[PDB]
Amino acid sequence: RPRFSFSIAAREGKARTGTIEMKRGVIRTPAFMPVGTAATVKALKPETVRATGADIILGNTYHLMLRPGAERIAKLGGLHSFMGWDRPILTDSGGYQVMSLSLTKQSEEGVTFKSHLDGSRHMLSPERSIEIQHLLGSDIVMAFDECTPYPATPSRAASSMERSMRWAKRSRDAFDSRKEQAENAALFGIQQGSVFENLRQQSADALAEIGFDGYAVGGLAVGEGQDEMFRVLDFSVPMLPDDKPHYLMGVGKPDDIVGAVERGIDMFDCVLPTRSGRNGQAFTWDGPINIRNARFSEDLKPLDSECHCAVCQKWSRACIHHLIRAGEILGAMLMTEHNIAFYQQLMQKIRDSISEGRFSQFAQDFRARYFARN
Amino acid sequence: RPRFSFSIAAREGKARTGTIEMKRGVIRTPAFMPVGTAATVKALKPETVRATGADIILGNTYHLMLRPGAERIAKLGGLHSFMGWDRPILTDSGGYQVMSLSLTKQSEEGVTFKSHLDGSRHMLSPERSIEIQHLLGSDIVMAFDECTPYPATPSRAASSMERSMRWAKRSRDAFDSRKEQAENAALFGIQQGSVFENLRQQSADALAEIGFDGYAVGGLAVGEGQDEMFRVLDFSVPMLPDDKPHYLMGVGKPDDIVGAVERGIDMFDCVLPTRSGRNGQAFTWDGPINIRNARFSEDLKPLDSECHCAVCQKWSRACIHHLIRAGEILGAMLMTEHNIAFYQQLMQKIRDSISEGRFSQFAQDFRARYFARN
Ligand SMILES: [Zn+2]
Ligand SMILES: [Zn+2]
Numbered sequence: 001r002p003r004f005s006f007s008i009a010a011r012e013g014k015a016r017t018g019t020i021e022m023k024r025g026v027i028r029t030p031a032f033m034p035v036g037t038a039a040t041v042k043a044l045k046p047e048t049v050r051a052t053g054a055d056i057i058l059g060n061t062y063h064l065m066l067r068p069g070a071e072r073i074a075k076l077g078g079l080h081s082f083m084g085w086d087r088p089i090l091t092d093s094g095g096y097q098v099m100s101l102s103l104t105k106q107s108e109e110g111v112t113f114k115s116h117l118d119g120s121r122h123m124l125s126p127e128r129s130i131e132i133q134h135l136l137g138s139d140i141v142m143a144f145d146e147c148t149p150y151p152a153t154p155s156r157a158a159s160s161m162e163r164s165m166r167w168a169k170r171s172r173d174a175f176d177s178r179k180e181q182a183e184n185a186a187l188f189g190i191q192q193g194s195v196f197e198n199l200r201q202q203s204a205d206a207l208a209e210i211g212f213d214g215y216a217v218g219g220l221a222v223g224e225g226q227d228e229m230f231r232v233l234d235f236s237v238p239m240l241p242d243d244k245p246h247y248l249m250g251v252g253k254p255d256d257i258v259g260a261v262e263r264g265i266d267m268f269d270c271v272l273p274t275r276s277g278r279n280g281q282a283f284t285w286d287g288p289i290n291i292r293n294a295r296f297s298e299d300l301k302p303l304d305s306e307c308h309c310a311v312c313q314k315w316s317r318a319c320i321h322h323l324i325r326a327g328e329i330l331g332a333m334l335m336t337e338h339n340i341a342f343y344q345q346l347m348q349k350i351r352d353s354i355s356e357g358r359f360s361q362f363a364q365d366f367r368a369r370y371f372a373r374n
Numbered sequence: 375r376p377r378f379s380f381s382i383a384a385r386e387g388k389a390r391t392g393t394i395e396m397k398r399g400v401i402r403t404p405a406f407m408p409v410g411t412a413a414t415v416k417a418l419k420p421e422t423v424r425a426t427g428a429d430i431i432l433g434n435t436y437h438l439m440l441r442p443g444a445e446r447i448a449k450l451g452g453l454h455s456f457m458g459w460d461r462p463i464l465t466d467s468g469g470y471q472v473m474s475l476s477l478t479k480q481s482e483e484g485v486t487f488k489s490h491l492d493g494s495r496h497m498l499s500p501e502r503s504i505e506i507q508h509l510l511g512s513d514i515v516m517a518f519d520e521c522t523p524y525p526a527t528p529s530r531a532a533s534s535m536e537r538s539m540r541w542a543k544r545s546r547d548a549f550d551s552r553k554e555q556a557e558n559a560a561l562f563g564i565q566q567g568s569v570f571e572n573l574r575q576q577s578a579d580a581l582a583e584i585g586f587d588g589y590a591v592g593g594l595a596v597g598e599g600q601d602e603m604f605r606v607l608d609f610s611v612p613m614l615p616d617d618k619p620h621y622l623m624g625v626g627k628p629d630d631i632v633g634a635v636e637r638g639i640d641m642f643d644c645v646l647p648t649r650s651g652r653n654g655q656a657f658t659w660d661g662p663i664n665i666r667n668a669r670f671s672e673d674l675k676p677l678d679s680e681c682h683c684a685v686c687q688k689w690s691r692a693c694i695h696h697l698i699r700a701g702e703i704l705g706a707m708l709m710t711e712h713n714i715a716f717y718q719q720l721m722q723k724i725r726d727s728i729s730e731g732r733f734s735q736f737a738q739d740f741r742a743r744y745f746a747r748n
Pocket of ligand 2: 683684685686712716
């Protein structure tokens with residue numbers, strides 16, 4: 001019923017659990033958002049993704065505007081039809097992929113780039129990104145920003161942050177200028193500032209002055225290492241409005257997530273569970289495992305003996321091992337389904353332990369078992 | 375190089391091993407002929423069937439003339455193109471399926487029947503069957519005959535046998551009337567006579583007077599039981615010309631085959647390995663097994679610990695068990711591949727043991743292990 005309503009059911013330190021209510025459904029916080037595809041035989045079925053625990057999936061604006069393009073998606077009935085997913089959908093701005101996959105020109109106005117598979121010209125800006133995310137019909141909209149490469153100078157970081165904040169205002173204005181969008185969707189602002197506390201602070205209150213439904217912590221997961229990331233999060237998150245969801249984009253190693261929840265993050269997304277699913281890496285409570293190893297050739301146990309997913313209730317490491325080695329598609333599908341389910345179960349344990357006030361103990365128990373392997 | 379050349383490399387009693395040389399390839403005797411399909415994703419690949427040991431496959435004329443029809447097959451380049459199989463292909467007359475799946479009218483002239491899936495009219499006769507098998511471009515041609523249902527009266531059996539012999543002559547004449555066919559393909563005659571020794575004898579020399587490249591023993595595998603079948607074969611086979619291949623149509627239980635080789639049979643065909651492959655039954659040296667049983671849920675051993683097929687060199691009973699239970703298509707494919715390979719390996723053991731003069735001992739060793747299960 002509500003456009004966007006964020007509640008906090010419980011807290012423990014900086015960590016916090018709750019829900020985000022939207023017209024297309026409820027999102028349980030902290031949340032992991034798997035990346036959606038297009039609902040074909042090559043990808044997992046929508047109902048399968050839903051059955052893993054996903055309350056909301058993510059769509060890459062950049063790839064979607066390249067193929068089959070935002071206009072086609074709109075004619076087809078939006079992303080929800082295209083992806084066969086009738087629950088909330090978040091779309092990124094498409095700016096990150098542009099500055100790492102494409103740029104014929106860049107300025108304060110925006111960027112124009114060539115299609116890395118067609119050569120055709122495409123333009124992106126705060127105004128255009130908002131419009132494109134509208135055509136896709138997403139529920140949560142990400143503001144268009146300028147991402148600064150890692151490592152970055154204190155000058156290049158301050159420059160890109162200052163621009164990203166002006167683009168934040170432009171994104172907000174574009175969003176509000178469209179009644180169908182502004183009254184039904186939500187808008188998140190992104191905080192930049194690299195590893196510099198002053199830039200982070202100047203970015204945070206700049207966004208707060210503009211006002212957003214949610215606030216993303218951008219600039220991380222670019223190769224800074226976990227320790228540096230936690231150190232950044234340590235001061236970055238408290239500068240963000242407490243009564244709004246905190247989104248940490250791109251971050252999604254299981255231990256990265258737990259540590260980020262300890263520091264106030266409410267939302268996560270990454271392609272790691274999907275990517276490593278096809279590459280033969282499975283996530284367990286005792287750390288990641290490579291299924292191709294000869295050890296799992298006759299291992300009758302499931303991928304994880306505590307995972308509740310439909311794969312672990314049926315398939316053993318042995319059969320999954322062979323399917324993967326045989327090049328059989330089913331094997332990669334099974335791995336992927338488990339991986340994203342495992343992630344959702346991690347989220348559920350986090351939510352549970354917070355509301356019971358036992359999350360601090362869970363975080364310690366988690367790392368102890370996860371890092372020890374075996 | 376030769377149209378049809380049958381050699382006997384070795385004998386042991388009534389049993390005999392050798393080769394059939396044809397323009398499209400050599401057929402090792404005794405031989406099992408699996409039933410071909412149409413080379414699609416639903417059926418095993420031609421190269422897979424070849425890799426199991428098959429020197430020749432069988433095509434059902436009746437089904438092929440119904441869909442997509444013999445004329446279409448001819449335009450497509452014949453059965454070899456249609457099935458993606460460039461080695462010898464035997465086609466049945468199509469008469470058996472007619473009298474058990476279709477008959478609007480029946481007489482000495484022939485039969486006309488309605489398509490059991492289109493209602494359309496189709497006509498079959500000694501002349502028409504030969505022509506249709508020509509359109510399909512098969513290498514071994516079966517003479518059109520009238521099959522007598524089981525059990526049959528001594529009158530109905532004598533009647534159908536006498537007709538089948540007149541149709542044998544008509545089949546031979548049609549075959550010889552077509553130069554492209556007569557000079558490149560082979561023709562087999564079928565012996566009828568039910569369980570009656572006099573009718574069998576009167577049928578045998580009737581065929582010998584006509585003369586055929588090979589001689590089939592028809593009228594069995596209609597539900598007479600193994601013991602009655604062996605009893606029939608005991609006198610039926612020696613009445614057939616010794617210097618020609620002996621074909622036992624429809625028969626193909628592993629123990630039925632071994633016993634039939636002991637009585638002089640050189641060729642076999644049946645859908646049992648293909649049918650039970652999809653139904654979850656696997657053939658082993660210790661008898662058939664039902665893969666759906668809970669016992670095989672964690673059985674790390676292959677289907678048969680002596681089978682050389684690619685499935686048993688990789689897949690365990692456990693993984694095959696799950697695939698079948700999951701309804702996964704791969705499971706039924708694996709079972710089928712093993713089953714037809716197991717059959718070819720049985721044939722190879724028969725050929726080997728005969729030429730070494732140890733087949734009588736092999737037959738005893740086979741039954742002892744096969745019937746004891748375990
Ligand atoms: Zn699992
Ligand atoms: Zn096998």
